[PDB]
Design a protein around this nucleic acid. Sequence first.
DNA 1: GCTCTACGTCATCA
DNA 2: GCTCTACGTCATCA
Lengths: 114, 115
Amino acid sequence: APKCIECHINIEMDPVLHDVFKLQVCKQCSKEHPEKYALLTKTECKEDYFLTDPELNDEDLFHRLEKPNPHSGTFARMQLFVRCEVEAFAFKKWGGEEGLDEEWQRREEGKAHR
Amino acid sequence: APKCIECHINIEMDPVLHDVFKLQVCKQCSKEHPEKYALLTKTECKEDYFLTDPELNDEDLFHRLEKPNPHSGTFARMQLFVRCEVEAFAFKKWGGEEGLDEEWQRREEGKAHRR
DNA sequence: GCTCTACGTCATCA
DNA sequence: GCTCTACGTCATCA
Ligand SMILES: [Zn+2]
Ligand SMILES: [Zn+2]
């Protein structure tokens, strides 16, 4: 049978990482490696990775899971991205983590400015 | 025999102001009164009246005529609004002609700030 | 640790 | 004297 690609043991994949994000990763290894598998909100993606609404709303660029807004089911749907995908785009976009941290550096000066 | 609201004489209305802007006015009168009947582009509307893309897109708030973009037919469509509508909305929004003039005054001063 | 949008300008590109 | 979008923050509101 096919095996979790992190641990090489488990045969029962995490239903969400599997069905939605297309990753053969079991549940236990999703927890044990949040640097890869942690589901972040759309706002977490904007602020941590400086991704813009036009790239987060590309259907053809990220998988997503959509959830009712925990604040109210009449507010816009919660969207959830798997961290390795957004990270992997964000590292192209800004040229690696070195380059990412420099844009963090750049905007915080902007606040001292204001 | 319905008559032109401007001249009170012609029976034949300008087909565009009639069909599209729902105005009972003749070609000759639209011409003589640009202050009421001139068709303005979407971009003329933003420059001159400080209306915004969200207002000008409201299907339920202005009539519009659409023509192919005169620069290229591959480009986004030209959108044409009638000056009585536009000016009317903008006067409500900016508190009259005087208020629209103040707003003008304010955005010139945004450029004197950015030298 | 929720999201959309609109402000605001302008530059592109279309 | 053509149009949209994006790039900016946020705030507000949904
Ligand atoms: Zn595993
Ligand atoms: Zn007439």
